[PDB]
Design a protein around this ligand. Structure first.
Ligand SMILES: O=C(O)[C@H]1O[C@@H](O)[C@H](O)[C@@H](O)[C@@H]1O
Ligand SMILES: O=C(O)[C@H]1O[C@@H](O)[C@H](O)[C@@H](O)[C@@H]1O
Ligand SMILES: O=C(O)[C@H]1O[C@@H](O)[C@H](O)[C@@H](O)[C@@H]1O
Ligand SMILES: O=C(O)[C@H]1O[C@@H](O)[C@H](O)[C@@H](O)[C@@H]1O
Ligand SMILES: O=C(O)[C@H]1O[C@@H](O)[C@H](O)[C@@H](O)[C@@H]1O
Ligand SMILES: O=C(O)[C@H]1O[C@@H](O)[C@H](O)[C@@H](O)[C@@H]1O
Ligand SMILES: O=C(O)[C@H]1O[C@@H](O)[C@H](O)[C@@H](O)[C@@H]1O
Ligand SMILES: O=C(O)[C@H]1O[C@@H](O)[C@H](O)[C@@H](O)[C@@H]1O
Ligand SMILES: O=C(O)[C@H]1O[C@@H](O)[C@H](O)[C@@H](O)[C@@H]1O
Ligand SMILES: O=C(O)[C@H]1O[C@@H](O)[C@H](O)[C@@H](O)[C@@H]1O
Ligand SMILES: O=C(O)[C@H]1O[C@@H](O)[C@H](O)[C@@H](O)[C@@H]1O
Ligand SMILES: O=C(O)[C@H]1O[C@@H](O)[C@H](O)[C@@H](O)[C@@H]1O
Lengths: 5, 5, 5, 5, 5, 5, 5, 5, 5, 5, 5, 5
């Protein structure tokens, strides 16, 4: 799960 | 904002 | 599953 | 908002 | 259990 | 995608 | 328990 | 992704 | 890679 | 949603 | 590596 | 969300 804000 | 679950 | 808001 | 499941 | 994709 | 368990 | 992905 | 337990 | 939604 | 990489 | 969201 | 590496 990786988020790039 | 993009998330890769 | 990847979402691009 | 587009999601690619 | 109900999922709404 | 939202699930309600 | 409800999750909103 | 937010879950409300 | 297998996902079970 | 469970993924097994 | 297995994740259970 | 629990991951078992
Ligand atoms: O675009 C970025 O700044 C960063 O994005 C992340 O996903 C990459 O792992 C990192 O190496 C990049 O520096
Ligand atoms: O359009 C964007 O900003 C981003 O969209 C994501 O899906 C791509 O993985 C990333 O490389 C892009 O920078
Ligand atoms: O790395 C991936 O498998 C995917 O990552 C997503 O962000 C991109 O939009 C998609 O084109 C790629 O196929
Ligand atoms: O990468 C893909 O297979 C698909 O991704 C979707 O977002 C595009 O609308 C579609 O035209 C592509 O064929
Ligand atoms: O919100 C919706 O569009 C739909 O959501 C589903 O869960 C309901 O069973 C269906 O009757 C609704 O039309
Ligand atoms: O905020 C949303 O888009 C959705 O969030 C879900 O939890 C609700 O069951 C659905 O009726 C909403 O349309
Ligand atoms: O039924 C429930 O407990 C919950 O279901 C979720 O989808 C709604 O977003 C939340 O407002 C409700 O409190
Ligand atoms: O229902 C709740 O207690 C909480 O649910 C969260 O999603 C809301 O962000 C928060 O403002 C509420 O206080
Ligand atoms: O557990 C399940 O319902 C399903 O899980 C999938 O991964 C299997 O390919 C399918 O044969 C099963 O019926
Ligand atoms: O605990 C669960 O509901 C699920 O957890 C997953 O990791 C298992 O592959 C699946 O067979 C189970 O049904
Ligand atoms: O195959 C595996 O290593 C693992 O796959 C997961 O889905 C099961 O929940 C876990 O008990 C197994 O040890
Ligand atoms: O398999 C393991 O080592 C561990 O996996 C975790 O998910 C269990 O909560 C923990 O009790 C086990 O000891």
């Amino acid at each position: 799960y990786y988020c790039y804000y």
